[PDB]
């Protein structure tokens, strides 16, 4: 299980540069290569471009000027930096362990083979949103658990996310140790320009007394964590 | 440079065969690659090298690549295979190298109806003492992805401090909606409650909640 993980600062302001690692777990940088990959809102993907583990590098010509991939062998990361944003920028960015490949059609004296590329291994993203406006944490309530949201042998609980920008907020309940019956939904972008969103959990009703359950709120770019407890 | 030409969409109904292709200017000749990006989720490699499989993929998937046309094809399609699906080349020549199609919508005909699950939640004791109330509802497992939502405060409609998503798909192929309607404390205790009444395909589903 390689897995890799993207970071990023969430908001960014025009003008700036817009930084970005990737962290892979569970398998080397070496041998292997590395690309960033976009999605403005709406968009398709758009290949920024990549890194072999010994420097070497590949761009799309559309970005080129503005970007610089680099690698760092000995923390097993890389990094994207791209001057001088607008709002065109602002997007999903993605890294993907990426693989060369060489299909010898011919007679290999002849020289007469290619070669290809293709990404096998995806992050699951990191939101950057280029905006002249402030980031704001969350404010989070308990949503408790009642006689009103129960279904028989299951019940809905939850925490409430109010208030912030820009998206992202994570949830987990637990610590990460419960994922079954989670569910965070999408966002509401409210008049005020701020975002809230709610996480439920669903559990069983016989041992709502005597369970604990705990939401883990986090908004990096406003760098706000806060755990609230959810009781009946 | 090297131009890819994917559908914007394909339509099938469940249990049918979906095909997706990418043009082509002697594509037969290149090496072609196909990801899924399902709603809300991060590309997925589903082909690779024309008809190579990853490990996990579904034995449903099957790539080929001949003359001017790569085709992805997915057998017994099912909901789950909704998604946008893009071919890849890498191109040598350059200048752009590495080429994306535009992308195909996968749309599944004829899913099954599901009515929404609605849960309501009336406004936390933390968050009354911090002068503040909100209302919270939430609209989960439905099909198809339209509801409409309506407010009452007692059996008053109110318009004011509403704000509700628009409907997305959940991990189960079905949809989820939220909507939020912020009340003064005040308001709150004055009410003997207040109600979320969802409609979907014609049939409402409407919660109540009240003050303790």
Same mark, same amino acid.
Request: net charge positive; glycine share 10%.
């Given at each position: ?125 990191? /939101? +950057?949103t280029? @905006? %002249?406006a402030? #980031?704001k944490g969350p404010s989070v309530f308990?949503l408790?658990?009642? *006689? ?10 939850g925490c409430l996310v109010k208030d912030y920008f820009p998206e992202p907020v994570?949830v ?11 569910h965070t939904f999408p966002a509401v972008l409210q008049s005020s320009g701020l975002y809230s969103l709610s996480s439920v959990? /669903? +559990?069983?009703? @016989? %041992?709502?007394? #005597? ?6 709120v986090?908004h990096?770019? *406003? ?10 | ?115 929404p699950?609605v849960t309501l939640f009336p406004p936390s004791?933390?968050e009354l003492?911090a002068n503040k109330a909100t209302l919270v509802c939430l609209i989960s497992?439905f099909?198809?992805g339209a509801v409409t939502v309506a407010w009452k405060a007692?059996?008053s409609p109110v318009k004011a401090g509403v704000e509700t998503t628009t409907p997305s ?6 949809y989820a909606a939220s909507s939020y309607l912020s009340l003064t404390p005040?308001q709150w ?5 207040y109600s979320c009444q969802v409609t979907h ?5 409407e919660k109540?909640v009240?003050?303790?």
């Open positions: 299980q390689v897995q890799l993980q993207e970071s990023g600062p969430g908001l960014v302001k025009p003008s700036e540069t817009l930084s970005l690692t990737c962290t892979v777990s569970g398998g080397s940088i070496s041998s292997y290569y590395w690309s960033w990959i976009r999605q403005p809102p709406g968009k398709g993907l758009e290949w920024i471009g990549y890194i072999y583990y010994s420097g070497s590098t590949n761009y799309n010509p559309s970005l080129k000027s503005r970007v610089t991939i680099s690698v760092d062998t000995s923390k097993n990361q890389f990094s994207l930096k791209l001057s001088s944003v607008t709002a065109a920028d602002t997007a999903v960015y993605y890294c993907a362990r990426t693989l060369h490949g060489r299909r010898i059609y011919g007679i290999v004296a002849f020289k007469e083979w290619f070669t290809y590329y293709y990404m096998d291994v995806w992050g699951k993203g990191t /939101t +950057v280029v @905006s %002249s402030s #980031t308990p408790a658990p009642s *006689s009103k949201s129960t279904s028989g042998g299951t019940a809905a609980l994570t987990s309940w637990n610590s990460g140790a419960l994922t079954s019956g989670v959990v /669903t +559990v069983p009703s @016989s %041992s709502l007394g #005597t369970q604990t359950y705990i939401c883990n986090n990096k770019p *406003s760098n706000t964590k806060v755990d609230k407890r959810v009781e009946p | 440079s090297y131009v890819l030409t994917q559908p914007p969409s394909v339509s099938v109904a469940p249990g049918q065969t979906a095909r997706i292709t990418c043009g082509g200017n002697n594509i037969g000749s290149k090496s072609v690659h196909w990801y899924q990006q399902k709603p809300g989720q991060a590309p997925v490699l589903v082909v690779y090298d024309d008809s190579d499989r990853p490990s996990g993929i579904p034995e449903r998937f099957s790539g080929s690549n001949s003359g001017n046309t790569a085709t992805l094809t997915i057998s017994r399609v099912e909901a789950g295979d909704e998604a946008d699906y893009y071919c890849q080349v890498w191109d040598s020549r350059g200048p752009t190298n590495w080429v994306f199609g535009g992308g195909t919508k996968l749309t599944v005909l004829g899913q099954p109806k599901a009515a699950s004791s933390e003492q497992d099909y198809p007692d059996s798909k959940q991990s189960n192929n079905k005040e205790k004055s009410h003997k409650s395909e014609g049939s409402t589903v109540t009240a003050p303790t």
